[PDB]
């Protein structure tokens, strides 16, 4: 994984010349950001198991998906998809305190769309699920930082489809 | 020296014979022999 | 024992015994008496099936009385009435526990480079089996041998 | 089922299937007909077991019913009406099967995750698969009430 | 038939084991170049091998005459020559007539093949070829042969050989010896078979013949014992990296942890501790579980730990579960801590690569588990098992017929297709003939042709893609405006006709010196209509060069019928027939044959410009199932947001 | 793994149904087939290498070149392995004729098979036709032997043949 | 893996028919080069280090691979293509002394088109160093020898391209 | 393990003889008190989870074993003893259902007895709870069969000790 420190490394190490002050720059700005990380970060990780709770409430339970005939109806299944949205908010942290979607580029996307289509996962409620995480971890952290999380939600979205 | 070349030198060619029927057509041959 | 292959199984995914399993316990215990009938028609009337099954064999493979065969010796032939006499001893044992585990362990697991270091032949004594299996349920009633021809069967099937 | 846990046994072996086996899918051949009997009988009085066993479980455990409760309101009292519903179509499955297989797959792994997520209680969900375990046994004879009771009776330690 | 496949990667079993064959691998296995044991192996076999050569060609020129004082000297009553294709135990010659002409067509022939088999034998150098073919033979052969007879038989041939020869004694030594080995193995009987038990109840179990083991090359297996002096120690330890990292790491980077080295030269901690504390540590974290999703990383640590890829389907969900709750670590200590991995290796066997010739194969993870064998496994960063084991139960996926990779990516221009080498995501699946795909059409969803064949020339109205028709008149069509009328208004409108035939050919619109200006005049002067137009710009050398030459037959043909038809193709019926014509007539008479066609004509008209008219589901999941575009109502339980009665 | 009772319930799970009717009727006909499904089970426990044997020396009689040169049951080695296979589809067959479901004869058997006879060269006519000749020589057999229904007998060996081989048409 | 001898006796019984002539006549030759194919592959196993050192001089130093933004910057990278260029010369080596490409198909062409695309490994300029080390085993060993190393080097460059 | 049905064939098959009449008794009062034991594992399998319970609050709860100082006052000790009891009670279940001590033998007093002396584990506490343990599932299932399980968990007892 590369984080936003690293990405500007790599940037300037690949054109083999020292990181000058519109490179430094981007260091700066992460600096100045990463006290709003850190915060954002430890109250996702205290609520973690109660931002899926809402998140499944908003747009999962009492649809189809949970009705016998569903991909969602097993507690099996259930408590996979419970998983699933488990690990999207859990990289989507990881991906924040990173400031980079290098993560999910590596550990989140890079073989999941291949994998959601062999179970016979659907993907378009899947992403709904994804946005409704999206809205309550917004709602629960701030404006500044839900917008933060919001990028990397839907970079994982973007991935899906 | 050049006793070495067994593959960078002249390649020995190999005899690979055409495939004949077998006794699966044993029937046949028999048949083959009769339509004369 | 059908008893302790239930609890082997339930060890192995670390729970207590299932409601099928309880029950497959229960059906064991009460054909048991059934069970007790088999050894005492067997392990008594001995001597008639052993004798029955090595004049069925030899008469099947005149080989090994034969000139250049494997039991020519009297205390060599002897040795091949012991090993009838251990494999009905082991199908008592058997059907008494109700599963193959009593045999298998003392009789099949490695059974096949036992007689190979001996130079007794396995497809050989894969025939010495069905004559005994053939000598047993003609002297066992119509329902006990259906119960008992199963396990001769897995003796077979382990060999050749 | 139990014909599955048999096969799957005995092919992890590689030795085709046991006389020990063979004896308990007779076994379960011979019980089917008294499997059924007990199935039609929970299948038959699906809509009087749920209703029974649900106002004992609102009358003992009120809490879950007071506000503030999980199963608090009308759509969320059908929920738990429903689900309960769903736990009595699974032992149905069960007692077919002969073991506690379809029931685990379906509707018990991962149950603790499950209701976690809802805000269940897992003792009070617990608590209606007991009573729904009387009101059945309590319609039924006492060697089917004994059989019926080993699948309620798995459902009860794997909530609890 | 079956709804997944895994893949079909060639396998080369060892059918006999040779001295080159023996001394190469011994030194492949084990990442090194051939040392002076190796290469004296190979200069004492070279300079004997001249001489196996005086030992086969004599053999081969007398073998006639070996076989005939050998059937003559077995067989008595007649001569069994008649149909060619020292120590007697207590042999009873058999009649000829008696044993009946099947099975002396059988004797016969085995005589040559055991003698055949012999001089293969010197040759290659390795009595490899007659311990495999020879063991289990004893057996199969007693139910209507007599073995009394064959070892006298063979024993004549020890002794024909023998005579016939007879140069020197370093010579016949190795006649004499491999002939002893041959009799020896007919003597011992058949062996057990190699029984590889289901570690659980998940697993099937498998059994393999004491043959297929004696031949399919040893996997060398190092076991640390606390007093093996610091040289094999090393090559164990070197094992045991060239195992977990699939490469020898500290030969190539120097990465190494010294720290457990020093505990298992001592005997601190086990080889299982090892591979424990390896697999756990930084340096596999890094390499094999940072680059790689929950899923693929899983999968390579089975094959780095237990040495085989998962078997079962309800395997991978048992240990991606593990994953879940611990992670790596977590993964780590269930495949160290089980019942298989101390039942193969135990404690101080390093793990090995359990393939095709090593033991018994299951039919089920066959091309999931041979690619993830090979050293190219760790770049394919898509799961091979979960992915085919979840594919095996449900029906056939979207997916184009001859595989995933021939699915171009619905965008507006450009044949962009998955690569089967770079980023290994190959999802075979066993497609026949009659099998239309499911697809979606762009318009009304009445519309389909599948269920409405009449609708298929209905244009899509505002659901779909624009429709370009010449309906108005083309400019200078009729001698109304005479000589001049500059502002002829009906000019802009072929133009812009010409621009949408020319962007559903190639997908964007073309340079200064590429467009057909011979074709643009023709159409514009009304000498051609819009479906030879068409066709001129899927004929253009052009066309050929840009999608036609840089991409795969079937690919091109694929993308070909996604521009002029503006649909991908329903199976396996289509495909055939343009791959048919691209044998034998070429890439010109497909264009020609995709025009001409009669779902083209009902489609588009001589005046209507090709439009996407069906999209692969796949395809509009990538359109519409993003951030945006994505409706609410698509897979979400939607609420009635009233205010509230207090409101 | 799959049988004839599970395979109804996931068919009655998957639509949330209760066990009706026609759900008790399709087991009362497995139970009352069964005592006859066990009964043959115990008849292919009984002659489970002679059959393969058999089968085995019928099919290289039909097809001779599989034992000759190039043919890919000439060897000792190749001839342990396609009788350890027929000893395979007999085993398998074994677990579906219990079973009264094909589930364990696509999982276990069938998935991965196509794939992997492809891979070594081994072929996939002679095979289901070794499969059929299987079958012939149970069902003979069971028609000797005091067996009241034989028909179920034919199911797994057919599916063998329906799944592995090739689409003639 | 196969070798020569054992791809002779395998056409043999294919045809089931004896070592006649033709078979004969490739196996002699085999065993004839074989004294001198064992003293080749002794040279280049010693000189295996000193080999690698000028085929890397001659094709890939002081170029825009070793360059930044090139494959062969990094020192992990430039690690990695030495083990490789290694591996390369140990391959020719076996096949050298097998008589046959095989070890090649399945141990190296198994797939290194598989590895490099997945990475981003140029293919000339891995042809170049190839074909630099062809030329420097000719130069060390012998024109005879290293035309005969020659055969298997351009088989891995060809299966590259 | 050695069940009581598999005891006296075991001891039977040392001896090489035949299962006399003096032999077949224990056997046929295995047969007899057979259906006793499945009902008493039944009763227990399904009340796992209280006898447990029922057991710590009798012996160990409110004591100086739980309080700061003693062996099960960190939670982390805390559920390694109910994890202990589980395990204790569970293959006590198997002993009695088997009829044998065999299985005690084997998979519980093989090395728990010097693995408690290596922790520091008081030897007097274990030997309490599952006295404790005893008198709780004899007063579940009956005095008929709790006298009969008393006897393998006083095994356990005197194994420990
Ligand atoms: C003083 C430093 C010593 C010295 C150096 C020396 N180095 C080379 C050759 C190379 N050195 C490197 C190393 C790197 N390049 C990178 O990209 C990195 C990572 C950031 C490092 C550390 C490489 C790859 C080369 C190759 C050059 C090329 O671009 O092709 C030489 C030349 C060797 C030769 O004979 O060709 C020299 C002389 N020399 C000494 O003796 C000093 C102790
Ligand atoms: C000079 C050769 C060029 C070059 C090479 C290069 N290779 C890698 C990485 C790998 N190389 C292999 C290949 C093999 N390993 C094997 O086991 C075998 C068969 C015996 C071969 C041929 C593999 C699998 C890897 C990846 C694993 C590893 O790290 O060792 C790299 C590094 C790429 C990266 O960024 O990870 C490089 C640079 N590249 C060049 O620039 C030269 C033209
Ligand atoms: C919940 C939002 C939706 C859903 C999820 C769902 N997932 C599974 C099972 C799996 N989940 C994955 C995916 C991943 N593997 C990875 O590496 C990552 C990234 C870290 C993820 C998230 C995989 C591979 C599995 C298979 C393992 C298993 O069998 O459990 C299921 C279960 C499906 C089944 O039983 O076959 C489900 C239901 N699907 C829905 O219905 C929700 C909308
Ligand atoms: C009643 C016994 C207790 C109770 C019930 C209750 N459950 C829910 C929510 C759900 N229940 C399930 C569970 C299942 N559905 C299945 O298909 C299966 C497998 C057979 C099970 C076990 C699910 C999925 C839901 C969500 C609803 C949906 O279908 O989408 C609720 C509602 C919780 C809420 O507020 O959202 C309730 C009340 N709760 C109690 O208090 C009782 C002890
Ligand atoms: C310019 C900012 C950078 C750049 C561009 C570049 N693009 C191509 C070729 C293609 N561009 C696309 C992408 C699209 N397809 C779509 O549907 C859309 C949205 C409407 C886009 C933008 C495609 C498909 C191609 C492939 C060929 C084609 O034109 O159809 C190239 C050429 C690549 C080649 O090797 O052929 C380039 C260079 N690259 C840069 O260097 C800029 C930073
Ligand atoms: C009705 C039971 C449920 C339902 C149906 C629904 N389907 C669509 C759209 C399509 N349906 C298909 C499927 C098929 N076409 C085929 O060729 C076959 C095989 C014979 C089938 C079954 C397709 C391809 C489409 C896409 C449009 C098209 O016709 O090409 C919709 C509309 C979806 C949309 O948003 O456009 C709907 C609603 N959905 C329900 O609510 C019912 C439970
Ligand atoms: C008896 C006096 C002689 C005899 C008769 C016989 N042969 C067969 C057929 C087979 N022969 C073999 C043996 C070999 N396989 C190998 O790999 C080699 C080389 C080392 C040999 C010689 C095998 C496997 C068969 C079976 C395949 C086939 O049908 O050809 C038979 C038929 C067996 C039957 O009854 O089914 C008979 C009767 N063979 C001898 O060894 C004696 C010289
Ligand atoms: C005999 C009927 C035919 C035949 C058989 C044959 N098969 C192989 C190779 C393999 N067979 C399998 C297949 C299976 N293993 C399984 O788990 C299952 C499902 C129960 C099957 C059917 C496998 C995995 C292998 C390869 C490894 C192994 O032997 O275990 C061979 C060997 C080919 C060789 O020469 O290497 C043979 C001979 N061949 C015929 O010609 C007959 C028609
Ligand atoms: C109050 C917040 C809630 C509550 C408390 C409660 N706890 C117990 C039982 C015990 N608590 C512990 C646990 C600990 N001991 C430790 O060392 C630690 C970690 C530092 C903890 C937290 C223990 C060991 C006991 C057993 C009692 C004893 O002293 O032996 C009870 C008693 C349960 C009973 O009925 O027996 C209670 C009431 N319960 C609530 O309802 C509150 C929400």
Known sequence: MQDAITAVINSADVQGKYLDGAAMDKLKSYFASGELRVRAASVISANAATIVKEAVAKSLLYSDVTRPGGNMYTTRRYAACIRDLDYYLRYATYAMLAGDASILDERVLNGLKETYNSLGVPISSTVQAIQAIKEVTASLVGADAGKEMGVYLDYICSGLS | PSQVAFASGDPIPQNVARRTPGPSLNRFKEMARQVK | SVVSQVILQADDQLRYPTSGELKGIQAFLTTGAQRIRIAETLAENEKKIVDQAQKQLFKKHPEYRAPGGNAYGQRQYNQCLRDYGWYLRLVTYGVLAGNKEPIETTGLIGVKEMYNSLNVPVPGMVDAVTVLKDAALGLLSAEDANETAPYFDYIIQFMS | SIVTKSIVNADAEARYLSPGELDRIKAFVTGGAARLRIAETLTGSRETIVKQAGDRLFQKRPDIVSPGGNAYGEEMTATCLRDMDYYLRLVTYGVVSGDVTPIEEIGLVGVREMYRSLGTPIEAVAQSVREMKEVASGLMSSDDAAEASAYFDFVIGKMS | ???????????????????????????????????????????????????????????????????????????????????????????????????????????????????????????????????????????????????????????????????????????????????????????????????????????????????????????????????????????????????????????????????????????????????????????????????????????????????????????????????????????????????????????????????????????????????????????????????????????????????????????????????????????????????????????????????????????????????????????????????????????????????????????????????????????????????????????????????????????????????????????????????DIASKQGFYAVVEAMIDSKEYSDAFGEDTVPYERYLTPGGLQMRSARVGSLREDIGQRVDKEVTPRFV | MRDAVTTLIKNYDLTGRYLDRNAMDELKAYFESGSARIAAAAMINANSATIVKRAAAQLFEEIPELIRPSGNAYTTRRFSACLRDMDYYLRYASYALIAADNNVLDERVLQGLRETYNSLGVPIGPTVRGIQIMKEMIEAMAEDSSLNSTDFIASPFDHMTRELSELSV
Chains 1, 7, 8 share one sequence.
């Not at chain 5, 023996?22 to 170049?33: G, L, M, N, V």
């Not at chain 5, 002409?101 to 293969?120: A, E, G, I, V």
């Not at chain 5, 010896?177 to 020896?184: E, K, V």
């Not at chain 5, 014992?225 to 490469?247: D, H, M």
Request: glycine fraction near 8%.
């Open chain 5, 1 to 579: 038939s079956v709804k997944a496949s895994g893949g079909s990667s060639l396998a080369r079993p060892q059918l006999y084991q040779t001295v080159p064959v023996s001394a190469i691998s011994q030194a492949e296995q084990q990442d090194r170049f051939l040392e002076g044991s190796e290469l004296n192996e190979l200069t004492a076999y070279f300079q004997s091998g001249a001489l196996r050569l005086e030992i086969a060609e004599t053999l081969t020129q007398n073998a006639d005459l070996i076989v005939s004082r050998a059937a003559n000297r077995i067989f008595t009553g007649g001569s069994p020559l008649s149909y060619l294709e020292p120590i007697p135990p207590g042999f009873r010659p058999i009649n000829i007539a008696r044993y009946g002409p099947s099975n002396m067509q059988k004797s016969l022939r085995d005589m040559s093949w055991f003698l055949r088999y012999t001089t293969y034998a010197i040759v290659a150098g390795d009595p490899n070829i007659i311990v495999v073919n020879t063991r289990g033979l004893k057996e199969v052969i007693e139910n209507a042969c007599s073995i009394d007879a064959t070892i006298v038989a063979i024993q004549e041939m020890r002794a024909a050989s023998a005579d016939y020869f007879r140069n020197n004694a370093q010579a016949k030594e190795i006649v004499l010896q491999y002939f002893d080995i041959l009799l020896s193995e007919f003597k011992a009987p058949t062996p057990a078979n190699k029984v590889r038990q289901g570690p659980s109840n998940d697993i099937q179990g498998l059994e393999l013949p004491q043959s297929y083991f004696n031949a399919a090359a040893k996997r060398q297996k190092y076991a640390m014992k606390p007093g093996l002096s610091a040289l094999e120690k090393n090559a164990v330890i070197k094992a045991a990296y060239r195992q977990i990292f699939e490469r020898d790491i500290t030969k190539a980077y120097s990465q190494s942890i010294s720290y457990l080295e020093s505990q298992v030269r001592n005997g601190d901690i086990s080889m299982k501790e090892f591979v424990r504390r390896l697999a756990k540590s930084p340096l596999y974290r890094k390499q094999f579980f940072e680059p790689f999703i929950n899923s693929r990383a899983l999968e390579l640590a089975f094959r780095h730990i237990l040495g085989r890829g998962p078997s079962s389907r309800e395997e991978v969900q048992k240990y991606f579960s593990i994953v879940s709750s611990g992670g790596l670590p977590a993964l780590v200590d269930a495949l160290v801590d089980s019942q298989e991995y101390a039942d193969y290796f135990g404690e101080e066997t390093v793990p090995y690569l359990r393939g095709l010739g090593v033991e018994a194969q299951e039919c089920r993870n066959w091309g999931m588990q041979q690619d993830l064998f090979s050293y190219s496994a760790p770049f394919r960063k898509v799961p091979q098992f979960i992915t085919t084991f979840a594919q095996y139960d449900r029906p056939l996926p979207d997916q184009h017929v001859y595989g995933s990779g021939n699915d171009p990516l619905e965008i507006q221009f450009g044949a962009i297709f998955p690569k089967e080498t770079r980023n290994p995501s190959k999802r075979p699946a066993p497609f026949n003939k009659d099998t239309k795909r499911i697809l979606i059409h762009r318009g009304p969803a009445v519309n389909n042709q599948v269920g409405n064949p009449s609708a298929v020339g209905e244009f899509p109205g505002s659901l779909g893609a624009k429709v370009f028709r010449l309906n108005g008149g083309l400019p200078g069509a009729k001698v109304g405006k005479n000589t001049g009328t500059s502002v002829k208004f009906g000019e802009s409108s072929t133009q812009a006709l010409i621009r949408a035939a020319y962007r559903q050919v190639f997908g964007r619109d073309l340079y200064e010196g590429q467009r057909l200006s011979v074709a643009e005049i023709q159409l514009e002067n009304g000498d051609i209509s819009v479906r030879e137009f068409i066709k001129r710009l899927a004929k253009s050398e052009l066309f050929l060069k840009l999608y036609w030459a840089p991409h795969y037959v079937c690919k091109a043909i694929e993308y070909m019928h996604r521009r002029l038809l503006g649909r991908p193709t329903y199976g396996r019926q289509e495909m055939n027939q343009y791959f």
